[PDB]
């Protein structure tokens, strides 16, 4: 499977990072997506770097559990629903 463990930074720009937990993923053509608790659009796409996906946008509502999914093209690969206020790095 393609599980992952995200962590967010926000003490007052709203940042959210997600790193794959599986050891050797191809990590090509697949992209992360964040839905729910957004302003203008219902879903927004991450940005890849090395093997970590990064989304930095102050348009977060910070309410409820937001849905982080992985898509390969237009089909979803896996999904999870996490509260962004609990995933905070030290």
């Amino acid at each position, epitope marked *: 499977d393609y599980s992952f463990s995200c962590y967010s930074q926000l003490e007052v720009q709203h940042s959210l990072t997600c790193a794959f937990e599986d050891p050797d993923v191809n990590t090509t053509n697949l992209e992360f997506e964040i839905c729910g608790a957004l302003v203008e659009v*219902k879903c927004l796409n991450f940005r890849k770097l090395q093997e970590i996906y990064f989304i930095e946008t102050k348009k977060f509502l910070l309410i409820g559990k937001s849905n982080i999914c992985v898509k390969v093209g237009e089909k979803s690969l896996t999904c999870k629903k996490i509260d962004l206020t609990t995933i905070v790095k030290p």
Partner: antibody, heavy 122, light 107 residues
Framework: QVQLQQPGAELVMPGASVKLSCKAS????????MHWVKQRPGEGLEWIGE????????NDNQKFKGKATLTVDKSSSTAYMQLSSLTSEDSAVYYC???????????????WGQGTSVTVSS | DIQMTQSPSSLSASLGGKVTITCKAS??????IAWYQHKPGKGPRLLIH???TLQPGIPSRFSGSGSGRDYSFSISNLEPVDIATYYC????????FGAGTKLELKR
């Protein structure tokens, strides 16, 4: 070829709690969401809530708080709506519909069910 | 919550004609509107999603348009198989349906 089957009608006296079923066939069950709609005899359509079969996440209308509780059995590929404390104002037709393919929360549906004509009377 | 005022409540046109139904939202729903056909007894059937994008199997005689708060839907070359009701639906923050439009064939 997407089938959504529900019982045509059920009669249960007020004050009890029933569980309407919605059995889906023709698609992967953990890939599409399910919505429920209440329709009074003369009134139109009223969305009740939506359930995600992947992990039983609910986005429900606040008008039906404590009344409707959307659950899901993944092995049988079935979605349930539990209505508690039935009254005469709950006697309506309850449709279940498959949501379009999306990860967003509020999204429309395409294929519907036949609806359960629930009648509440002692 | 978002009031979806539909108009008219009931209309009628001739065989092979064209009918038009409008829906006005109480706020900007950002082109998130769909139109549903509802025959008596049987369940609803989606015709057009996202203002004007059709569904597989829906003929090209069902058109739609609109912006922000005002949207319109049209049926051309009326066939006798289109005698039903038609509902709107917004999906920007909630799921509010319109009042419906009873279509009638003028024979």
């Amino acid at each position: 070829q997407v089938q959504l089957q529900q019982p045509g009608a059920e009669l249960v006296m007020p004050g009890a709690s029933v569980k309407l079923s919605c059995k889906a066939s023709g698609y992967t069950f953990t890939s599409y969401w399910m919505h429920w709609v209440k329709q009074r005899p003369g009134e139109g359509l009223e969305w009740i809530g939506e359930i995600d079969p992947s992990d039983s996440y609910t986005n429900d209308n606040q008008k039906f708080k404590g009344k409707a509780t959307l659950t899901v059995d993944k092995s049988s590929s079935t979605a349930y709506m539990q209505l508690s404390s039935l009254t005469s104002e709950d006697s309506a037709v309850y449709y279940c519909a498959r949501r379009l393919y999306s990860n967003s929360y509020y999204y429309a549906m395409d294929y519907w069910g036949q609806g359960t004509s629930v009648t509440v009377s002692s | 919550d978002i009031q979806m005022t539909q108009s008219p409540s009931s209309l009628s046109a001739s065989l092979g004609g064209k009918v038009t139904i409008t829906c006005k939202a109480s706020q900007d729903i950002k082109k998130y509107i769909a139109w549903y056909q509802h025959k008596p007894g049987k369940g609803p059937r989606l015709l057009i999603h996202y203002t004007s994008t059709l569904q597989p199997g829906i003929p090209s005689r069902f058109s739609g348009s609109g912006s922000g708060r005002d949207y319109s839907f049209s049926i051309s070359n009326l066939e006798p198989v289109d005698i039903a009701t038609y509902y709107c639906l917004q999906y920007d923050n909630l799921l509010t349906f319109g009042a419906g439009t009873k279509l009638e064939l003028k024979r």
